[PDB]
Write a protein that binds this DNA or RNA. Structure first.
Length: 96
DNA sequence: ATCAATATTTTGACTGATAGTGACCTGTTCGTTGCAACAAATTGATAAGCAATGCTTTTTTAGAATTCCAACTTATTGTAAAAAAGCAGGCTTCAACGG
């Protein structure tokens, strides 16, 4: 699984950047994105996807184990709509 | 031409920088490690994305024009002694107007 460790190492052998800043950029990368989502801003990354924010209302739910119907509290989640470019590169993938 | 005193002739004390290694402190990097975070697994009513593909709107894109940055290659131009006037910063007196 791709981790921040592998991402930093990549920037070291592709951009020749020290692992230090290579590890600091990967952190600030996801950080800045999370700061935009929490602030209520859409994140549109061309050639990748789009992190949307939809306010879901309180809908009926339950306890998957027993079956006790419990109303799922409303909350703002963070969806991800992959671009057409990304889909065309993952359409022919393979779980490995 | 020889006394006699002061600047002269090498050494030593004075005071903090010069010299080069070493300890001090801890960012920074790497190995050991703990733990919040992530993933599998349920069950079932309700919400969101989905197949194709040309036209329209929004965002990223590769130059290319433009102008300061820059190491070179040209294009023109060229004065000083020797006098002897020409101006203002402030203290100095005569000459005209008013009591």
């Amino acid at each position: 699984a791709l981790t921040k460790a592998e991402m930093s190492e990549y920037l070291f052998d592709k951009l020749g950047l020290s692992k230090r800043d290579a590890k600091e950029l990967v952190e600030l990368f996801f950080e800045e994105i999370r700061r935009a989502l929490e602030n209520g801003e859409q994140v549109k990354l061309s050639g990748f996807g789009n992190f949307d924010l939809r306010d879901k209302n309180q809908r009926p739910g339950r306890n998957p184990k027993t079956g006790e119907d419990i109303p799922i509290t409303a909350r703002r989640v963070v969806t991800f709509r992959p671009g057409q470019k990304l889909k065309s590169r993952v359409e022919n993938a393979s779980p490995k």
